[PDB]
Design a protein around this ligand. Structure first.
Ligand SMILES: CC(C)CCN1CC[C@@H](NC(=O)c2cc(Cn3c(=O)[nH]c(=O)c4ccccc43)ccc2F)C1
Length: 351
């Protein structure tokens, strides 16, 4: 084949996110049986069906027995097969079981998109598959220059917003990509001049990124249990890099992770201290802010293309009885997100 004229960082990114064995490795982390439910047999209607059974388990948990829960728990394992042998699988009887399986199904939908792109489309042996798979993302990916002003700001945002409670690792920036999804700037147009626009982190495991870069950051479907998410079904961001970095699910077994920096139109923020499982904001509000105990220093804010970057060192917020150690931002319209950068990170585990 032609050998591909993309930059080397962009080629390694494409290899990373379209890695088939990594998708299988991700599925087994959720205790799924690849013998019964392999990567090829995965589909949206199976995942939505599973979401719905998880919504029924939510219902029984919220109204209190282990007799009826058994039936609802088993119907979930029917739709998404798990690897337990001749088993008796673990009972899904609490809020944690609902949250845990909801976050799995979240990941399965992103993996299904990644694999469907991979096994959809055309097969040209004369083209480099790195180029072929790059075009399927419908995203322009350019490498940011390490001496640029935007690179200095971004590295400082990584540097300053690593929390003391997440000091089992620290992060090196390997590559900084400027990204532009097809039609996203057009979709963002109603919110482009809205007040309180902020550059915020979104971390996910590397097997989600083909899905994210093709479909954008999305909302979990109607079938999904709204109790499974702390502030309901929206798109979640953080202003502390380490908080988002944790959702990469790096370890000593693959700490090369990916993380987004997106422009989020927060507007009038509906501020909250504790969990509120809502599927629609109160009138006049454009986002939720989960109030953190710690927050980046408001006086040390910096502008990048007219977008605030909260890159100050973590200080006390003056908020008392909150569930959250750090801030949290949620939007419930996908048009309020415009993804600007993607960072490839280097997790130095000190344990
Ligand atoms: C399931 C599939 C159709 C894609 C639908 N969503 C794309 C966005 C994905 N998930 C989220 O935005 C989300 C992500 C999390 C966890 N999370 C997270 O994964 N990364 C973060 O940076 C983060 C920051 C603050 C709080 C939570 C974070 C919790 C609830 C969510 F709804 C699922």
């Amino acid at each position: 084949h032609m050998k591909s004229k993309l930059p080397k960082p962009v080629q390694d990114l494409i290899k990373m996110i379209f890695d088939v064995e990594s998708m299988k490795k991700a599925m087994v982390e959720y205790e799924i049986d690849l013998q019964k439910m392999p990567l090829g047999k995965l589909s949206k209607r199976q995942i939505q069906a599973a979401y719905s059974i998880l919504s029924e388990v939510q219902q029984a948990v919220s109204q209190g027995s282990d007799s009826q829960i058994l039936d609802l728990s088993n119907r979930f394992y029917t739709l998404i097969p798990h690897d337990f042998g001749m088993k008796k699988p673990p009972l899904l009887n609490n809020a944690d079981s609902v949250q845990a399986k909801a976050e799995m199904l979240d990941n399965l939908l992103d993996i299904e998109v990644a694999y469907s792109l991979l096994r959809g489309g055309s097969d040209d042996s004369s083209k480099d598959p790195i180029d072929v798979n790059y075009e399927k993302l419908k995203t322009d990916i350019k490498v940011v220059d390490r001496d640029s002003e935007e690179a200095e700001i971004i590295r400082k945002y990584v540097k300053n917003t690593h929390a003391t409670t997440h000091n089992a690792y620290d992060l090196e920036v390997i590559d900084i990509f400027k990204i532009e999804r097809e039609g996203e700037c057009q979709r963002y147009k109603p919110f482009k001049q809205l007040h309180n626009r902020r550059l915020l982190w979104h971390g996910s495991r590397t097997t989600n990124f083909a899905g994210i870069l093709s479909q954008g950051l999305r909302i979990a479907p109607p079938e999904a249990p709204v109790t499974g998410y702390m502030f309901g079904k929206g798109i979640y961001f953080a202003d502390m890099v380490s908080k988002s970095a944790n959702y990469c699910h790096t370890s000593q077994g693959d700490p090369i992770g990916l993380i987004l920096l997106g422009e989020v139109a927060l507007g009038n923020m509906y501020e909250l201290k504790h969990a509120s499982h809502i599927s629609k904001l109160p009138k006049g509000k454009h986002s939720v802010k989960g109030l953190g105990k710690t927050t980046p220093d408001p006086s040390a804010n910096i502008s990048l293309d007219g977008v605030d970057v909260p890159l100050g060192t973590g200080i006390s917020s003056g908020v008392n009885d909150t569930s959250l150690l750090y801030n949290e931002y949620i939007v419930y319209d996908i048009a309020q997100v415009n993804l600007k950068y993607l960072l490839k990170l280097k997790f130095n585990f000190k344990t």
